[PDB]
């Protein structure tokens, strides 16, 4: 034998998310009888990209509120302000998320609130 030292499939893919855990989760879960090697890499990459997008929007909103730590509020702000993510999660509730600030124009008072004589 030689027993070449094992690197992780993640490290072969240049990714941070795992692979092996995903493969196990696909085997246990009644999705298909057999699973091909390529699938979990693709899936992991998809997850990484989405996660990166979300966090990036969250951190931008964070810098807008002068806080250095991400809290759920920021995630809600990121989600509803991107049309596509809002489409994906249109029927999802984020805990402690609240909603966007939005008042319909019509029920705000008229701008004629000033000198009137």
């Amino acid at each position: 034998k030689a027993r070449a030292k094992a690197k992780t499939r993640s490290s072969r893919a240049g990714l941070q998310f795992p692979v092996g855990r995903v493969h196990r989760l696909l085997r246990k879960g009644n999705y298909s009888e057999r699973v091909g090697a390529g699938a979990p890499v693709y899936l992991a990459a998809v997850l990484e990209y989405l996660t990166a997008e979300i966090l990036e929007l969250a951190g931008n909103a964070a810098r807008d509120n002068k806080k250095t730590r991400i809290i759920p509020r920021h995630l809600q702000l990121a989600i509803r302000n991107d049309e596509e993510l809002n489409k994906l999660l249109g029927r999802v509730t984020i805990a402690q998320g609240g909603v966007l600030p939005n008042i319909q124009a019509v029920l705000l008072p008229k701008k004629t609130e000033s000198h009137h004589k």
């Binding site: 855990r21 298909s32 009888e33 057999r34 998809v46 996660t51 966090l55 250095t68 991400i70």
Partner: protein, 97 residues
């Protein structure tokens, strides 16, 4: 002394966060949110792939099926970019064995 073992996606989310915004942290509740989010998307995609497989009388889930399900579930440009990353990932993995 008895002790269990619950897995999550926490550590990996932390890595990604440090990659995109080094001087920023994240609370436990939000990490839980991200964990549940990952689990939800995983479940949707796998189920959809399964349904496609079963409809075409093919017993193997491949990269192709995942790609298809991604195009079905997600809209537009998000799909295209994510698909790009996936294809790049497969090309790197398949070469450097």
């Amino acid at each position: 002394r008895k002790r269990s073992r619950k897995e999550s996606y926490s550590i990996y989310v932390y890595k990604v966060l440090k990659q995109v915004h080094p001087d920023t942290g994240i609370s436990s509740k939000a990490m839980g949110i991200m964990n549940s989010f990952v689990n939800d998307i995983f479940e949707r995609i796998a189920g959809e792939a399964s349904r496609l497989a079963h409809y075409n009388k093919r017993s193997t889930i491949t990269s192709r099926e995942i790609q298809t399900a991604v195009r079905l579930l997600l809209p537009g440009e998000l799909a295209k970019h994510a698909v790009s990353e996936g294809t790049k990932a497969v090309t790197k993995y398949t070469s450097a064995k």
